[PDB]
Scaffold this motif. Structure first.
Motif: not given
Ligand code: A1A1I
Ligand code: ZN
Lengths: 276, 822, 382, 298
Positions: A157-172
């Motif tokens: 929830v800290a690093y979200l770009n194209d809304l949704h996408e809460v299941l694919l890991p995306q953070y440093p």
């Protein structure tokens, strides 16, 4: 109050997932005075056992989720017992991890490996026995929201770009390991159990972030975590003075997954400074 | 089948030799056992004097002389292979000499399997007991008391199940056995004490010593040395408890020391020999002479010369050594002190004939003076030869210095075709180099097979320097001068197996047809071979036809103007076409490997090593082979032969011979298909080749066989009346004739195998019947008392003990006459 | 490829159940002794000594006979019925129960038993008991052990170097092609006395034939060590015999071979002569060959298993099969190999049930797929 | 365990053996799953722990209820609620005239509610096959055999690769996708929805490549236009044959327009745009849903 940290969801609807998570947080009761039922024990050997389990996870490249599942299993299994000696403690610890292993990672290490890690103090039959009575004592309620799972949620929830996408890991990958390193340092002492796991992860997140990122990400407010932050001060500090580590690499693990593996470097050396 | 078996030549291969004071208290005697005959000589300065020869009902497996306390002469201990033992004593009464049986008994155990290493018999030096190693895991002791006339014995458990060799030590208050054995982590030497009053094993006077991995000979050194000497592939060691002394000379590395002898009573020096037939002397020099004791100092060994491949050695005093051989002529040689004629210290001064391992013989006769000549392939390796036996008994030896395998005779060319094998070594530069000049390398003319159809070119596997290869030749030997007129060498890795000399089809030329098998060390079963047709015309040996086959041509035979051969497990009938070619005509496929294959008329008899014998017939106007009969029971078979159209005779394991019949009854198409056995007999010899022919001229037929131990035997067929008469005479002779060792004739001739034993049926022993003329008249009058001879018509009851003399004397002249020993 | 299956489960027969009694008893019989022995009427198996036979018995008299035969001895006669399947049994095998179990649960008797063969017999008479039970009056055939081929012709001076040092470790350079070349040259040195060469006597040598058979037994499911395949040639021959996929008439002839030497020669005979396993009643399809045969159990490529309905199947395990189609979908019920699911396999031409296709169902299992072909529908060929 | 009395063997799931037993106390029929821990070297199997742990947190009208768990020495028993049949045997028994369209509507509507309940609880069934969908005489279909289930995290990470039965395996799982999620179960439901109407398996392949080629033949060869990232998937090769989107009017005849749209959404190639269970429950096809009672002889 926890309004709605998580965005709008596609595979489900956000409100239900959220209240299910909160009710799971409510259902699994944990007590920080679970050691008083056992007069022989002290928080120090609990910390020692947790650190030894950390080392065991690091040896076999077990995930952080496995370690925190074992931690929850131990902290909930001792609270339903009475007058246990320290000699049994190690066995119980490994048994928890052993159970946690089967629950989380794809290819468990075999039972003989777990017995060999104990250096002959615990046998495979003993491990199976203690795992079975553990599964009874927890009434098979073996799916809690751990401290690190909350951290994963908060990081997404800290690093979200194209809304949704809460299941694919995306953070440093370095902030996550720093926050987890703080969290396991805070996990060795008993009184951490006083605060909810979600609140624990949120405050540890704040100690390496700002006061607004926490509130946007966690749904919490300043008052409910003032005590948690005030108590965590030493931990965050000793860690800041020591200096954070780096994202190390592991054999047979993809470079995008190494942050999800337990890394034990040194904790007991910092706890005594923290408790001073 | 009502047969009659007799021996036309006693065994000539000596299997044991011993020296000692047997005849009298002071003269030196040499006792030689060959198979069943014990020959006693008195050794003199002139040589050997043949004082006596006795025949025993058994195969002498172990024999030693021993003098117990309070005895004037030496007693003899003999154990035969049916596991019966006897203690014998020589006595002479003026002019009659007989072998008293001082003791006798049977020694075999009801349950137990014969040891792999074989029967070992040893006798307490000072003669307190006799030790026997017969079965694995137990060592049986016969106490040599004055009351053990029945040879009662008791078995002590041996912990070591693989005992290589065992001997009785010298100079021990309690009897001691030193034995070398093997355990699954090494080869050790250790000792035991035998306790008779309590019948067990006590700890020996040495320690369990780890010895050479190929140690195979323990010899007991007498006083004042004591101890034992262990001999193996690499080194000779001496152990005397604490004292140890080993030497590893390079001179004995070529061959394996197999036989040994002690030539000095002090034990200062020994004699030994190896497989290759060379003789060494093992010197033990005292050179210590301490305050009161004498010990060994070194164990040097030296070369002495070459002798016949030796099976046994004995020292007959004053430089003379008797070398007993099973592969060649026995020798009686002399060891000079400083001869060094070329490097050899031995000179041969007497040779004793030895028909040896007769592997194949032929009967040659055109004119009927004695109507017989027996040409036999004898010997092996350096002393392979061919022996010509004539009755005029003249034995003429033609040495080949190579092993002879098969022999066949061609009348038109006046020549013998002999298959021979030669051993060669692999050179560093690449190629085969010969050990000694043999008949194959010293022929008047030579040829090498140039066949190119065997390209092969599939893993040639160039061997290593030092490897042993076996080259095979066909030799054309003259029949008057016995000179090798031609030698034809076969291809590499070609084992020649069969050889026939016969006419084929509608051409007038006679041929030498040989069958071969290409043998390779990786391929267990050959998958390719040749059938080669040679012609020996005016000096040369031309190959007329060559035929590929997909397997080994084990045996083949001429059959009504055709050939029929055995290729692995198929029997193939070839017809020799008009254009000098061999074309296949008939095929049969069997479940057994056609090793032995003999035909008569239109019947073919095939068989393998496993005794499973099949009998086929050739149907002229249908064009194939029809299976008539076959009996299959597991046993090792050495040779087969077809007596007549119904009876088939073969040789099988434990030195037995059998006859199986065909047809009879013929109830329900299965009785005639069953080859029911009719006759069994215990020959006591491993018969090797079995052919027809009469060697001298109420018995119809004459089939003669040659065995491993050098015996030549003749089996004929009798009728109902004569079989009954001589079988009745056989029992009546067994109650009047007393054997050496009190061995029952029925037990000795009983068909034997280590799964079963039954009395001999359908066979009449010719030797026992012919021993009727060696009995005295008053003893002859008890055999024929209540008989019924019968001839003209009436039984004439009495038979007068002169009529049976005529009968037995007429039976005697169907074979050769045995020369008298002396 | 690699096989981390722990091949002991197929021999354990865990699909038969949990609470199985485990009699440790043994029994024998005198040679050529006339014995009266009960017979199972529904088993058509040709049992070879040393083979494990699982059975599931439903019929009331069969429950009764096993129940009363458990105490007095534990042997029954498995007759090796000839091509004429009804009666007409001339020879057979004795089988002794080593595991027995009774469950009245579900309201049906069912007796679950595991037996193993001990002896072979000839049946001289076949009487019938009072309640549809066949009693065979039989004579025990003999196990004729044959001595070494040089035990008769042997120089007693050379009979002392006839033991040989030891086995040369296990399958090294200059340790298989060299040690046996020196073993043949020292054990058959007296073959020069006879009329046959050494390589002929090697063809009838028990040790040599056992080694030559083991050379091929290693290609099917490489062997750990000589723990299996007992050193005794009789046991080794009987064990190898149970693995050959040959048909029933060949199996009968093999079971009549008295000597171990001839049995090994016949097994080694039909080990390279055979080339292809083909459809039996269809006779045209090429199902598999030797090269894909591999063993998934200690018993070897072939073993005897039992379906829930009691029928006994000899299932040969192969890596790859062709001309077969699958009917239905994978099921893990009553699976003979734990951790695998079966799918019924039939041949492409005649739609005859030939076997099953086993597929992996658990995690980290090495052979992802293989085929178990029943022996009753296979006809070995050229 | 002395109170239950076995009556008949039902079958074997992913592990253990399932029997039918009647409780002697209240006289109700239940099923009993039995596990033999003595044979299991790794104690209680991972599937057992997973299914027991998840099944006590999921309480829905359309998920098989876990009544009670016990341990009697060397045996583990799970008591379930008794369902009279499975979907597969009902479909086979109705292979001639067939399941009514309203009945298929009700079955798929009731499966979607249970699947949405599991997905709201972050639970991946991953074993949606007709053997595991149990029906009764009252007209209710329920999910069973959670042995292969897993609680996926937020974010998800890599889990077990080859999962779900081959005939119901999603294309991304076949193509070796790094991360998989809820959509796989939806795919299975589609593969079952079309199975309820055409009455045979939609993609009956006996191997991975087969299955994949059959999926392509029915639905066309995917490209970067319809499914971003196929060309970068680990198991995708450029040699795949080019087939063109066989019309659903022939693949699944007996159903009408809205059903065709819903099934096409359930069989979308990309997981990201594949229809979620909740947004599938809002489809117009579920506008006139009922609860008919199947008549299921046998
Ligand atoms: C009430 C209710 C009914 C049905 S049902 O009727 O639909 C069903 C019964 C069924 C199960 C399958 N057998 C069919 C038979 C087919 C033949 N066979 C078989 C097997 C091996 C064979 C073989 C065979 F013939 N042969 C000839 C061979 O040679 N071999 C060998 C063997 C070795 C090998 O390796 N190879 C081979 O080939 C197996 C049985 C019965 C029919 C279908 C479904 C559900 C229910 N109720 C219910 N309630 C509550 C619960 C709660 C939890 C839960 O999990 N469950 C279920 C458990 C399982 C699924 C869910 C529940 N279930
Ligand atoms: Zn077919």
């Amino acid at each position: 109050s926890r309004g709605s940290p998580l965005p709008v969801l596609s595979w489900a609807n956000r409100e239900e997932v959220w209240k299910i998570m909160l009710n799971k947080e409510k259902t699994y009761l944990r007590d920080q005075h679970f050691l008083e039922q056992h007069p022989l024990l002290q928080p120090k050997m609990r910390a020692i056992l947790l650190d030894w389990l950390m080392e065991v996870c690091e040896v076999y490249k077990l995930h952080r989720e496995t370690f925190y599942l074992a931690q929850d299993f131990f902290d909930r299994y001792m609270a339903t017992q009475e007058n246990v000696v320290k000699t049994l403690l190690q066995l119980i610890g490994i048994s928890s991890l052993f159970i946690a292993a089967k629950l989380e990672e794809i290819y468990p290490p075999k039972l003989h490996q777990f017995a060999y890690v104990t250096d002959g103090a615990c046998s495979g039959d003993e491990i199976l026995t203690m795992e079975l009575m553990i599964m009874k004592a927890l009434k098979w309620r073996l799916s809690p929201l751990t401290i690190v799972s909350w951290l994963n949620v908060y990081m997404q929830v800290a690093y979200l770009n194209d809304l949704h996408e809460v299941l694919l890991p995306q953070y440093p990958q370095q902030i996550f390991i720093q926050i987890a390193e703080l969290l396991d340092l805070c996990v060795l002492d008993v009184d951490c159990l006083e605060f909810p796991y979600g609140i624990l992860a949120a405050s540890a997140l704040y100690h390496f972030s700002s006061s607004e990122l926490m509130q946007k990400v966690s749904g919490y407010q300043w008052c409910d975590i003032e005590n948690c932050v005030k108590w965590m001060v030493p931990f965050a500090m000793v860690i800041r003075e020591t200096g954070s580590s780096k994202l190390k690499h592991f054999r047979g693990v993809a470079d995008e997954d190494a942050h999800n593996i337990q890394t034990h470097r040194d904790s007991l050396d910092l706890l005594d400074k923290a408790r001073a | 089948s009502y047969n009659y078996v007799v021996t036309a030549q006693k065994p000539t291969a000596v299997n044991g030799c011993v020296t000692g004071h047997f005849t009298s208290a002071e003269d030196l005697n040499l006792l030689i056992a060959k198979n069943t005959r014990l020959e006693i000589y008195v050794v003199t300065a002139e040589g050997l004097r043949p004082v006596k020869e006795v025949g025993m009902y058994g195969k002498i497996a172990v024999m030693e002389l021993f003098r117990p306390k309070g005895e004037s002469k030496d007693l003899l201990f003999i154990l035969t292979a049916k596991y019966n033992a006897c203690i014998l004593e020589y006595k002479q009464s003026g002019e009659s000499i007989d072998i008293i049986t001082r003791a006798h008994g049977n020694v075999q155990d009801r349950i137990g399997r014969p040891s792999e290493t074989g029967i070992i018999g040893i006798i307490d030096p000072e003669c307190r007991m006799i030790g026997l190693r017969l079965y694995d895991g137990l060592f049986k002791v016969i106490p040599l008391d004055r009351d053990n006339k029945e040879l009662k014995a008791f078995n002590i458990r041996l912990e070591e199940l693989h005992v290589i060799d065992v001997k009785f030590l010298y100079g021990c208050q309690a009897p001691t056995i030193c034995f070398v054995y093997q355990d699954p982590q090494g080869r050790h030497v250790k000792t035991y004490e035998v306790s008779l009053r309590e019948k067990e094993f006590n700890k020996g006077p040495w320690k369990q010593e780890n010895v050479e991995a190929e140690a195979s000979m323990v010899i007991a050194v007498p006083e004042p040395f004591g101890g034992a000497i262990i001999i193996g592939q690499e080194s000779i060691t001496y152990h005397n408890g604490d004292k140890y002394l080993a030497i590893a000379p390079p001179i004995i590395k070529q061959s394996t020391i197999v036989c040994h002898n002690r030539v000095d009573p002090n034990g200062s020096r020994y004699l030994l020999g190896d497989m290759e037939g060379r003789l060494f002397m093992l010197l033990l020099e005292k050179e210590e002479q301490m305050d009161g004791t004498v010990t060994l100092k070194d164990l040097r060994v030296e070369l002495l010369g070459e002798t016949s491949i030796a099976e046994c050695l004995t020292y007959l005093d004053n430089g003379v050594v008797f070398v007993g051989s099973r592969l060649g002529d026995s020798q009686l040689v002399k060891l000079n002190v400083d001869s060094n004629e070329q490097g050899s210290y031995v000179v041969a001064m007497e040779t004793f004939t030895n028909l040896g391992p007769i592997v194949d013989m032929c009967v040659v006769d055109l004119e009927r003076q004695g109507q017989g000549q027996l040409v036999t392939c004898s010997g092996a390796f350096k002393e392979g030869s061919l022996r010509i036996i004539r009755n005029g008994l003249h034995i003429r030896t033609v040495p080949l210095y190579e092993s002879p395998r098969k022999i066949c005779y061609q009348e038109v060319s006046q020549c013998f075709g002999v298959l021979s094998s030669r051993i060669e070594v692999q050179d560093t530069s690449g190629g085969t180099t010969a050990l000694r000049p043999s008949a194959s390398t010293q022929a008047l003319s030579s040829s090498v097979s140039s066949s190119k159809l065997f390209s092969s070119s599939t893993a040639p596997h160039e061997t290593s320097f030092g490897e042993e290869v076996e080259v095979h030749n066909l030799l054309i030997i003259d029949q008057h001068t016995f000179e090798v007129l031609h030698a034809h060498q076969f291809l590499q890795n070609e084992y020649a197996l069969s050889l026939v000399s016969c006419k084929l089809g509608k051409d007038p030329n006679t041929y030498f047809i040989v069958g071969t098998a290409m043998v390779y060390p990786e391929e267990a079963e050959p998958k390719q071979g040749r059938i080669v047709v040679f012609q020996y015309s005016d000096g040369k040996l031309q190959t007329v036809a060559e035929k590929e086959v997909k397997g080994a041509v084990y045996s083949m035979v001429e059959f009504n103007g055709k050939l029929l051969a055995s290729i692995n497990s198929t029997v193939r009938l070839y017809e020799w076409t008009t254009e000098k070619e061999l074309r296949t005509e008939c095929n049969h496929y069997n479940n057994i490997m056609a090793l032995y294959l003999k035909t008569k008329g239109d019947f073919i008899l095939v068989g393998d090593l496993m005794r499973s014998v099949l009998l086929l017939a050739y149907k002229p106007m249908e064009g194939n082979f029809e299976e008539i009969a076959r009996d299959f029971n597991p046993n090792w078979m050495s040779a087969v032969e077809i007596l007549d159209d119904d009876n088939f005779l073969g040789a099988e394991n434990a030195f037995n011979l059998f006859v199986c019949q065909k047809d009879s009854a013929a109830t329900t198409d299965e009785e005639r298909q069953h080859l029911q056995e009719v006759g069994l007999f215990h020959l006591g010899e491993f018969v090797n080749v079995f052919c027809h022919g009469s060697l001298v001229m109420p018995t119809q037929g004459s089939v003669l066989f040659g065995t491993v131990n050098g015996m030549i035997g003749l089996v004929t067929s009798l009728s109902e009346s004569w079989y009954n008469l001589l079988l009745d005479m056989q029992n009546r002779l067994n109650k009047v004739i007393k054997s050496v060792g009190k061995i029952e004739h029925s037990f000795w001739r009983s068909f034997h195998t280590e799964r079963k034993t039954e009395p001999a049926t359908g066979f009449i022993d010719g030797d026992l019947i012919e021993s009727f003329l060696d009995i005295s008249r008053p003893k002859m009058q008890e055999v024929v008392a209540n008989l019924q001879y019968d001839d003209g018509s009436g039984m004439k009851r009495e038979a007068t003990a002169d009529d049976l003399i005529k009968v037995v004397e007429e039976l005697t002249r169907i074979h050769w006459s045995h020369p008298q020993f002396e | 490829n690699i096989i981390n299956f722990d091949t002991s489960l197929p021999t354990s027969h865990t699909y038969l159940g949990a609470d199985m009694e485990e009699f440790h008893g043994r029994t024998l019989h005198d040679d050529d002794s006339c014995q009266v022995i009960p017979v199972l009427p529904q088993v058509m198996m040709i049992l070879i000594p040393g083979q494990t036979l699982p059975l599931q018995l439903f019929h009331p008299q069969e429950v009764s006979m096993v129940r009363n035969l458990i105490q007095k001895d534990r042997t029954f006669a498995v007759l090796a019925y000839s091509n004429v399947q009804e009666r007409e049994a001339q020879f057979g095998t004795t089988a002794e129960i080593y595991a027995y179990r009774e469950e009245q649960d579900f309201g049906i008797e069912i007796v679950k038993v595991k037996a193993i063969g001990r002896q072979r017999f000839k049946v001289l008479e076949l009487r019938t008991q009072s309640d549809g039970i066949q009693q065979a009056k039989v004579q025990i055939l003999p196990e004729c052990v044959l001595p070494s081929t040089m035990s008769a012709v042997q120089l007693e001076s050379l009979n002392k170097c006839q033991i040989f040092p030891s086995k040369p470790v296990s399958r090294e350079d200059q340790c298989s092609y060299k040690w046996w070349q020196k073993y043949q040259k020292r054990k058959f040195h007296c073959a020069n006395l006879t009329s046959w060469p050494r390589w002929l006597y090697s063809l009838y040598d028990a040790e040599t034939l056992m080694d030559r058979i083991k050379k091929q037994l290693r290609e099917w499911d490489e062997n750990l060590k000589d723990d299996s395949l007992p050193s005794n040639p009789i046991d080794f021959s009987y064990r190898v015999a149970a693995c050959l996929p040959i048909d029933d008439v060949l199996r009968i002839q093999l079971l009549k071979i008295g000597s171990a030497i001839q049995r090994l020669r016949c097994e080694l005979d039909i080990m390279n002569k055979c080339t292809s396993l083909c459809c039996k009643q269809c006779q045209e399809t090429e199902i598999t060959t030797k090269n894909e045969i591999f063993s998934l159990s200690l018993c070897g490529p072939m073993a005897a298993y039992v379906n829930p309905h009691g029928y006994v199947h000899e299932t040969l395990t192969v890596y790859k099969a062709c001309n077969l189609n699958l009917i239905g979908r994978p099921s893990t019920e009553h699976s003979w190999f734990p951790g695998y699911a079966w799918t019924v396999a039939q041949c492409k031409i005649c739609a005859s049930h030939i076997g099953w296709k086993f597929t992996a169902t658990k995690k980290d299992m090495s052979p992802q797929k293989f085929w178990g072909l029943t022996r009753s529908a296979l006809l070995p060929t050229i | 365990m002395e109170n239950f009395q076995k009556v008949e063997k039902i079958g074997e799931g992913t592990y253990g053996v399932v029997y039918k037993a009647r409780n002697k106390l209240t006289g109700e029929v239940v099923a009993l799953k039995k596990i033999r821990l003595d044979t299991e070297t790794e104690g209680v199997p991972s599937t057992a722990i997973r299914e027991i742990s998840l099944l006590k947190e999921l309480n829905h009208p359309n998920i098989v209820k876990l009544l009670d768990v016990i341990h009697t020495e060397n045996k583990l028993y799970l008591v379930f609620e008794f369902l009279h049949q499975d979907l597969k045997k009902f479909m086979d028994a109705s292979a001639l005239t067939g399941i009514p369209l309203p009945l298929i509507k009700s079955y798929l509507f009731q499966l979607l509610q249970g699947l949405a309940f599991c997905h709201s609880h972050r639970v991946l069934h991953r074993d949606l096959k007709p053997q595991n969908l149990l029906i009764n005489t009252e007209g209710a279909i329920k999910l069973a055999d959670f042995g292969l289930a897993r609680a996926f995290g937020v974010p998800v990470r890599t889990y077990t690769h080859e999962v779900v039965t081959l005939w119901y395996r999603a294309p991304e799982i076949l193509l070796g996708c790094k991360y998989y999620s809820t959509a796989v179960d939806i795919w299975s439901l589609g593969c079952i929805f079309a199975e309820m109407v055409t009455r045979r398996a939609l993609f009956p392949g006996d191997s991975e490549i087969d299955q994949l080629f059959r999926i392509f033949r029915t639905l066309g060869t995917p490209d970067e236009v319809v499914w971003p990232g196929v060309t970068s998937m680990p198991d995708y090769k450029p040699s795949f044959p080019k087939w063109a989107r066989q019309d659903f009017s022939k693949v699944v005849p007996p159903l009408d327009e809205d059903g065709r749209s819903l099934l096409s959404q359930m069989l979308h190639y990309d997981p990201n745009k594949r229809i979620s269970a909740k947004a599938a429950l809002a489809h117009p096809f579920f506008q006139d849903v009922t609860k008919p009672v199947p008549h299921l002889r046998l």
